[PDB]
Design a protein around this ligand. Structure first.
Ligand SMILES: CCCCCCCCCCCCCCCCCC(=O)OC[C@H](COP(=O)([O-])OCC[N+](C)(C)C)OC(=O)CCCCCCCCCCCCCCCCC
Ligand SMILES: CCCCCCCCCCOCCOCCOCCOCCOCCO
Ligand SMILES: CCCCCCCCOCCOCCOCCOCCO
Ligand SMILES: CCCCCCCCOCCOCCOCCOCCO
Ligand SMILES: CCCCCCCCOCCOCCOCCOCCO
Ligand SMILES: CCCCCCCCOCCOCCOCCOCCO
Ligand SMILES: CCCCCCCCOCCOCCOCCOCCO
Ligand SMILES: CCCCCCCCOCCOCCOCCOCCO
Ligand SMILES: CCCCCCCCOCCOCCOCCOCCO
Ligand SMILES: CCCCCCCCOCCOCCOCCOCCO
Ligand SMILES: CCCCCCCCOCCOCCOCCOCCO
Ligand SMILES: CCCCCCCCOCCOCCOCCOCCO
Ligand SMILES: CCCCCCCCOCCOCCOCCOCCO
Ligand SMILES: CCCCCCCCOCCOCCOCCOCCO
Ligand SMILES: [Zn+2]
Length: 444
């Protein structure tokens, strides 16, 4: 192994790391699936939190998602393994060159060929994802009562998302690739700065110019909820401007500056809210009453007051800086390219692909995991901020009702949930909302 050629050590290590992660995640998923199969009546830590009918409905939902997840993750690991072993990436590259030369563009036009590759690669991935997304939407989600869309809506939506993605992706990619080629030895600072500016622009225009292409937004109607939101926002110096409702119910009954609220979150504005004896119980409808929406807003506004959003932005740009720096260190190493079937050329984009996705693999995994732990910490802090606003009782209630409307299963394997859950389990959140309050607490 030591004496194995570097190009073989590189390829082998990327592929073995892939398989290792996949086996670790298959192991974890099995432990969680076992809980769905095993935990067949409500535990006593939970009598007050779910009734037996909702519990079975959630267990059955989550178990179908888990089975679908096993097959998706097996197909995805196989497809990736086979692409790597049989050179699908050099193949698609050479195929992109072939399109270029029948349009009169020779190999010297590398960025052009790169943009063709970007189009085909994203198309391929879009196409191979489509059977799975259709099955999840029109079998799993349909079966358990959540899907609201037709196939025609689904396909209209998919094409529009793909087109809009290309409209932004390709021009931005031609420039970033140019910048990389024309800077140096400090090109990576300008590469980093350009991606920061693109990221800033995109985030600044998304609400007005991209989001309304895909969803219907309407102002929250005048009433008691609109006014309590305004009071709360003032109370924390939040410069609330307008409250909008997004008609998520065009897609799904699931429920999740400006404030935007899903209509499925709102008992009295959900579009989806608008028999042998009882009949009456068939009045159990979706969304949260107003005092619950407010506590959830209290939580969301905690992410703002506590500066979590600013911390996430800083983390992502420091990470982006670090990766562009290391890309600069590594991109002259011709063995990295040869590992993946690029012998006669070292295209810049192929370089980004290999270094950011393959070589940086272990760092990407460690960082994902670190961000997941941090996320859990921020969620407890946002819950605690709503407690501090005086809304613990309503947030407690809110989390139970949303868990029910979305059929969350509130028992999890501790290892699976440590690895995967960006929000702490429901029961851990409810216990935290029950604790005491405040005095001096100056016992540092
Ligand atoms: C325990 C370790 C284990 O492999 O669990 C196998 C688990 C199941 O373990 P099991 O021991 O619970 O048996 C399951 C039997 N049924 C389904 C009838 C309940 O199987 C898998 O998830 C395949 C994952 C492969 C990743 C683990 C690699 C094992 C080491 C080689
Ligand atoms: C689909 C095939 C596309 C091939 C293009 C490869 C693009 C690789 O990433 C380029 C990075 O450019 C943006 C910089 O963003 C900062 C990256 O920080 C995270 C790095 O991890 C990437 C893997 O998720
Ligand atoms: C010089 O070469 C350094 C490249 O390191 C690649 C290690 O790959 C790890 C992928 O899991
Ligand atoms: C290459 C295309 C692959 C197509 C995707 C199939 C995904 C397989 O997952 C199936 C397992 O879970 C599905 C559960 O939903 C069906 C419920 O059937 C009714 C049982 O009462
Ligand atoms: C060689 C590994 C490739 C794995 C990809 C196959 C994915 C398609 O499989 C669909 C699974 O459908 C299974 C139906 O399951 C019965 C119902 O659920 C239990
Ligand atoms: C020679 C080292 C192999 C030890 C780890 C086994 C990896 C198995 O994971 C495969 C899972 O993905 C399905 C597609 O890959 C099938 C080939 O795996 C064979 C591993 O030699
Ligand atoms: O296609 C997506 C499937 O990916 C599986 C293998 O891809 C190689 C990436 O290796 C890094 C994974 O840690
Ligand atoms: C001729 O070269 C073909 C290389 O293989 C192309 C297919 O690789 C991806 C398989 O999945
Ligand atoms: C068969 O052709 C295989 C094409 O697969 C290429 C996958 O490229 C995606 C880039 O990661
Ligand atoms: C619930 C909303 C679902 O809308 C369906 C279309 O969404 C756009 C993307 O298409 C689904 C993702 O497809 C997987 C990759 O092809
Ligand atoms: C495999 O793909 C499964 C597709 O499931 C149905 C898709 O079309 C249903 C529209 O009624
Ligand atoms: O070609 C035109 C659209 O075809 C792609 C269909 O599915 C797209 C799914 O969304 C992908 C977004 O990257
Ligand atoms: C993990 C805690 C989740 C709660 C807060 C979510 C905050 C969103 O953070 C994601 C930010 O990433 C997008 C990058 O934005 C680019 C802005 O560019 C910087 C301009 O100076
Ligand atoms: C070959 C390694 O390149 C090192 C890249 O690191 C930044 C270089 O900036 C100073 C070069 O003179
Ligand atoms: Zn939160």
């Amino acid at each position: 192994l030591w004496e194995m050629p570097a190009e073989k050590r590189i390829f082998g290590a990327v592929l073995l790391f892939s398989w290792t992660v996949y086996l670790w995640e298959t192991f974890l998923a099995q432990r969680q699936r076992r809980i769905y199969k095993t935990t067949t009546h409500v535990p006593p830590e939970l009598g007050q939190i779910m009734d037996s009918e909702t519990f079975e409905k959630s267990r059955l939902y989550q178990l179908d998602k888990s089975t679908f997840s096993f097959w998706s993750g097996l197909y995805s690991e196989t497809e990736g393994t086979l692409i790597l072993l049989f050179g699908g990436i050099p193949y698609l590259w050479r195929l992109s060159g072939r399109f270029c030369g029948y349009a009169g563009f020779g190999p010297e036009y590398e960025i052009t060929q790169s943009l063709v590759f970007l189009l085909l690669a994203t198309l391929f991935s879009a196409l191979t994802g489509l059977p799975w997304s259709l099955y999840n939407t029109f079998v799993i989600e349909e079966k358990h009562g959540f899907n609201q869309q037709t196939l025609g809506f689904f396909m209209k939506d998919a094409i529009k998302k793909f087109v809009v993605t290309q409209c932004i992706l390709l021009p931005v990619s031609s420039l970033l690739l140019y910048i990389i080629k024309i800077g140096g030895d400090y090109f990576f600072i300008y590469a980093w700065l350009f991606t920061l500016v693109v990221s800033l622009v995109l985030v600044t225009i998304y609400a007005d110019y991209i989001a309304p292409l895909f969803d219907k937004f309407t102002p929250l109607p005048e009433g008691k909820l609109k006014e309590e939101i305004e009071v709360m926002a003032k109370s924390i110096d939040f410069p609330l401007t307008k409250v909008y409702v997004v008609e998520g119910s065009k897609r799904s009954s699931h429920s999740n500056k400006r404030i935007v609220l899903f209509d499925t979150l709102l008992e009295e504005y959900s579009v989806l809210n608008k028999e042998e004896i009882k009949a009456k119980v068939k009045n159990k409808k979706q969304g949260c009453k107003n005092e619950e929406v407010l506590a959830v807003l209290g939580h969301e506004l905690g992410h703002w007051k506590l500066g979590h959003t600013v911390k996430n932005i800083i983390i992502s740009q420091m990470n982006s800086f670090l990766c562009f720096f290391l890309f600069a260190v590594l991109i002259g190493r011709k063995e990295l390219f040869a590992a993946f079937g690029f012998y006669d050329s070292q295209p810049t984009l192929i370089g980004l692909l290999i270094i950011f996705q393959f070589i940086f693999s272990p760092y990407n995994e460690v960082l994902s995991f670190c961000l997941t732990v941090l996320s859990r910490r921020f969620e407890f802090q946002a819950d605690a901020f709503a407690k501090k606003l005086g809304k613990a009782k309503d947030l407690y209630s809110a989390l139970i009702k949303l868990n029910k409307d979305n059929l969350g299963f509130p028992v999890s394997d501790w290892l699976f949930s440590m690895w995967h859950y960006s929000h702490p389990p429901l029961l851990e959140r409810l216990q935290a909302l029950k604790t005491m309050k405040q005095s001096g607490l100056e016992v540092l």
